[PDB]
Enzyme design. Sequence first.
Site, PDB file in Angstrom:
ATOM      1  N   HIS A 185       0.829  -1.191   0.000  1.00  0.00           N
ATOM      2  CA  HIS A 185       0.000   0.000   0.000  1.00  0.00           C
ATOM      3  C   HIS A 185       0.862   1.238   0.000  1.00  0.00           C
ATOM      4  O   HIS A 185       1.546   1.544   0.985  1.00  0.00           O
ATOM      5  CB  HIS A 185      -0.900   0.088   1.200  1.00  0.00           C
ATOM      6  CG  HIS A 185      -1.658   1.372   1.262  1.00  0.00           C
ATOM      7  ND1 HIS A 185      -2.899   1.528   0.686  1.00  0.00           N
ATOM      8  CD2 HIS A 185      -1.337   2.571   1.800  1.00  0.00           C
ATOM      9  CE1 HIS A 185      -3.313   2.769   0.871  1.00  0.00           C
ATOM     10  NE2 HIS A 185      -2.383   3.422   1.545  1.00  0.00           N
ATOM     11  N   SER A 229       0.273   7.692   9.921  1.00  0.00           N
ATOM     12  CA  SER A 229      -0.977   7.378  10.602  1.00  0.00           C
ATOM     13  C   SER A 229      -1.300   5.895  10.585  1.00  0.00           C
ATOM     14  O   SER A 229      -1.764   5.327  11.581  1.00  0.00           O
ATOM     15  CB  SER A 229      -2.131   8.139   9.958  1.00  0.00           C
ATOM     16  OG  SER A 229      -3.355   7.811  10.594  1.00  0.00           O
ATOM     17  N   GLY A 253      -2.784   2.583  13.025  1.00  0.00           N
ATOM     18  CA  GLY A 253      -3.482   1.671  12.145  1.00  0.00           C
ATOM     19  C   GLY A 253      -4.426   2.244  11.127  1.00  0.00           C
ATOM     20  O   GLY A 253      -4.867   3.376  11.220  1.00  0.00           O
ATOM     21  N   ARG A 257     -12.997   6.431   7.701  1.00  0.00           N
ATOM     22  CA  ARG A 257     -13.416   7.658   8.363  1.00  0.00           C
ATOM     23  C   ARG A 257     -14.415   8.392   7.486  1.00  0.00           C
ATOM     24  O   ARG A 257     -14.037   9.071   6.529  1.00  0.00           O
ATOM     25  CB  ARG A 257     -12.242   8.600   8.601  1.00  0.00           C
ATOM     26  CG  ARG A 257     -11.125   8.111   9.474  1.00  0.00           C
ATOM     27  CD  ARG A 257      -9.937   9.004   9.178  1.00  0.00           C
ATOM     28  NE  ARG A 257      -8.650   8.481   9.622  1.00  0.00           N
ATOM     29  CZ  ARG A 257      -8.169   8.616  10.853  1.00  0.00           C
ATOM     30  NH1 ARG A 257      -8.874   9.259  11.773  1.00  0.00           N
ATOM     31  NH2 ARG A 257      -6.972   8.127  11.160  1.00  0.00           N
ATOM     32  N   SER A 258     -15.691   8.256   7.805  1.00  0.00           N
ATOM     33  CA  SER A 258     -16.717   8.939   7.043  1.00  0.00           C
ATOM     34  C   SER A 258     -16.715   8.520   5.579  1.00  0.00           C
ATOM     35  O   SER A 258     -16.463   9.322   4.689  1.00  0.00           O
ATOM     36  CB  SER A 258     -16.509  10.451   7.155  1.00  0.00           C
ATOM     37  OG  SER A 258     -16.498  10.867   8.512  1.00  0.00           O
ATOM     38  N   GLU A 299      -5.347  -5.447  -8.266  1.00  0.00           N
ATOM     39  CA  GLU A 299      -5.470  -4.703  -7.028  1.00  0.00           C
ATOM     40  C   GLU A 299      -6.323  -5.506  -6.072  1.00  0.00           C
ATOM     41  O   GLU A 299      -7.061  -6.401  -6.483  1.00  0.00           O
ATOM     42  CB  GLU A 299      -6.102  -3.328  -7.263  1.00  0.00           C
ATOM     43  CG  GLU A 299      -7.360  -3.298  -8.116  1.00  0.00           C
ATOM     44  CD  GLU A 299      -7.908  -1.881  -8.295  1.00  0.00           C
ATOM     45  OE1 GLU A 299      -7.177  -0.999  -8.798  1.00  0.00           O
ATOM     46  OE2 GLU A 299      -9.077  -1.645  -7.932  1.00  0.00           O
TER      47      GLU A 299
END
Lengths: 823, 207
Positions: free
Chosen positions: B42, B51, B56, B60-61, B155
């Site tokens: 990644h 982060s 981890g 988020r939203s 991917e």
Amino acid sequence: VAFTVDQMRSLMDKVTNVRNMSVIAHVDHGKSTLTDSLVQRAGIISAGITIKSTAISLYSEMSDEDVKEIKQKTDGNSFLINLIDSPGHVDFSSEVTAALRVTDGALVVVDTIEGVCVQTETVLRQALGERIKPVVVINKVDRALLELQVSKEDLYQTFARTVESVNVIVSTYADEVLGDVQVYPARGTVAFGSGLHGWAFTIRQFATRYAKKFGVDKAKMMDRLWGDSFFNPKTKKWTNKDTDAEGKPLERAFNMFILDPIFRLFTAIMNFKKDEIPVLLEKLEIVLKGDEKDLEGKALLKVVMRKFLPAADALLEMIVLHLPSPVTAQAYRAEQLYEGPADDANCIAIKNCDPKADLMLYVSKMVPTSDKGRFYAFGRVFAGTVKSGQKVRIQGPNYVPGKKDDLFIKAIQRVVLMMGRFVEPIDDCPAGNIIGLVGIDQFLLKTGTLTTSETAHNMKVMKFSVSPVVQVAVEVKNANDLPKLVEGLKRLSKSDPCVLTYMSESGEHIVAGTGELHLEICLQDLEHDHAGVPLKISPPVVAYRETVESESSQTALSKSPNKHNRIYLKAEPIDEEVSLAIENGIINPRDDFKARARIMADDYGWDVTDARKIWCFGPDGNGPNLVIDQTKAVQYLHEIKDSVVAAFQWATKEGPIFGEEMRSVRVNILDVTLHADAIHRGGGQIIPTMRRATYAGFLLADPKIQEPVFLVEIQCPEQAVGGIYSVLNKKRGQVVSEEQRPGTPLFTVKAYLPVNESFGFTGELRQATGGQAFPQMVFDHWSTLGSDPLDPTSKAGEIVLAARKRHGMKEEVPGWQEYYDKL
Amino acid sequence: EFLGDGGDVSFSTRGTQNWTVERLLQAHRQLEERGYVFVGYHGTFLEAAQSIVFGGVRARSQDLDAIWRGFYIAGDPALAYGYAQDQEPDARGRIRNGALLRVYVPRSSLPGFYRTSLTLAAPEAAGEVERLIGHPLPLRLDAITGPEEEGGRLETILGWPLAERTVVIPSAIPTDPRNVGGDLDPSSIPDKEQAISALPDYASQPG
Ligand SMILES: CN(C)CC(=O)Nc1ccc2[nH]c(=O)c3ccccc3c2c1
């Protein structure tokens, strides 16, 4: 004492009663000490902006009787002395000449034991070259007695030899026109004393004292106090032979009435003979004041000598009575300081120090102020009068009455007095004074000329350069203080116009200067003041430039990550002329694209078509590199312009050969293909593409690197000129010219010295020319090395490989394929 | 702590501080010893990288109506490489390089990794992915591996739930600070990292 602006102004109107001087002296010879004494004595104080102390104002008064002994027009008993600051070491060549060029007199300090040291000898030569009248002082006499315990006659012979050495210099290098400028103790132009203890005297002082005890007009009393003049105690007669009728020896007058009084107090006090001290003191009318009475040993002598012979006054006596005013000197210094017709309307005005004529103000240096990161100009008004608000013509280094290059017709915001550390606003200021100006900082880098006459040439310019050719990486040894470094760097760059601090892509903090020493100093002042935090400094390095020799072998092409946008371009060389033109404001980024185009087309053989399509310059938006938009019918093209430019700024700041700046690189955008939707044509997408294409283009246009080169001017006695060519031949130096100063045996060699070969140059030149040589070197031009930066063994490739390794990059240089599309 | 030992790890444009191949090897060995397996690479930006490794991976939203929401990674570092860089310029105009991250999941989740030959965007994709995972999209405690697009590299899309259970550490494959936009050079991949980079064998038929 404290003076009001009026008093000061009023004093500045009687130029005949002003004295502009410096103090030539080795630091280890009480230079700082003696200077203070004058400040602690006649220092002028005014009755929230601080500056870097550049000049100190001194006030001194004398009797109508003394005013007469002045063989030069005067008026009034008041005098204004401008003590202009000097450097500590001689290596500061350029700024040594700066201080000198604005003074008329000079207080040369020589040592009793050591005499005239090499260094002082050299600066004195330079001073004489500017036609500065010297006045000598033999300091550190104490060290002669206390240490050597020398006899009255041996100490005399000492001064004699010393004064003789000096005059050997004064006569050999002073101009015949000036007339005999040698120093003569009997004439009151040589003082003796000790800065430590704080005492000093002149034959003229003891002559005013012994003046009547013998029935003499001091003229002949001081004339006897030196040389061969004897006074038989017995016969009570004045003779001119060291022996009386029978053959017995006779003490010289100097040893009898000068050295003896002083020698006893020393012998009395330092031997603690309390019976004599009081008696001896009263005879010289030296009244100790209560508390001082109990003192003994050095402590005492130190206080006695101060009341006895106040060092400060001895010096202030010579300054007024012998140093020329800004009237006497300009008459014979004008021609030398004006680079125009010796009969020009201004040159004349210089000679006559006429406050009515067109302005002729000389800016010797820019000094850092508290008021922002602004700098105030420091100089002298050689002609006319400068006044707040008055708009003036600011003629820079490259100016020439003919053209309009390097000119800035602006208004003088404010005129202020350089009262040492503080400034004091003053309406105007007539010719003959040292003054300070406010509001030129963005027009004059360091030196320059201010005039009003449209046909006024510049005054003897002092070559300075703002070209960062040497730099280093600064790191904090203890990571905690990092923010304290981030502050001082910002602080340092703020104190000096020519230092530079910036951050590389690599995130390093860089410090770049004008040279080895210039940077050296900058680094000290950083780890000691501006940051005062311990730092890890990298070894010195010469700044190079990355350039191309031809047009890109084939079209360069790259596409964004999207794989939706493409940029097609080719790179080609820019003519040194054009680059210089860009570097010298001719071809300007801020100009009208049309006007600018007309210029490039006309004077530089550019297709007005291409020139009208310039998208930007670089780096820093004004470097000698361009991007030309040669595309044809590319829809939305303008929507990616900012990105393209942005990219160009990074591409030119750190090229692909080894992270150096590009110079004289032309980039023609041949074609562009853009996604129909903006979303996919953002900066994140275009910026890397252009950057890569540019690199590709670059690598395909036959890469080469340039090295900077200095123009070193050297003053040196015909006898030592040998050492010059000697060292120049072991540094790849190239002699440009060598001349001689008509009268004297002073040659002046000028040559080219490769910056990357100038490390420790002064040090080596020292040994070579017995220290008689006086260097003055400045950045001159960029030289394109012939060798292939791509070939590791070649000469340039050697530079590149080392640099690459140093930066921890891949040892080999990326081929163009790495940046071309991976097709 | 899955970062092996040897001093604080951070992410720089300069390179990843304190992360040698040797350390990598130790970290990887110890992740296996606790039952984790490597599933892909990644790439992303320095800030982001930091982060994910200390805190981890966390959704988020996300757009709840967005059915392919998840954490994309790739078996091939080269494809990951592409995303290792700021996506927009800083105020000055600099687009700096980023870093490659190695993704590990609890071995215990492999039962939910599936593969397909359809290209994830294709009409059939939706239905066929769903056929393989046993429920409507988005993915949850499962993952799908397939062509980035016709003929492209592959991917992997871990569902947000699974992704939050990952353990990511730095790669010994450096990004180039002087060639942001170039394609990862096969020779800059350390051989030893290559040795510890095999992928698990994903199921092509539902469970
Ligand atoms: C919109 N941004 C929050 C980021 C985004 O949409 N995607 C993103 C952000 C980073 C990514 N990094 C990868 O290594 C990768 C590998 C294969 C396929 C996708 C990715 C990848 C995708």
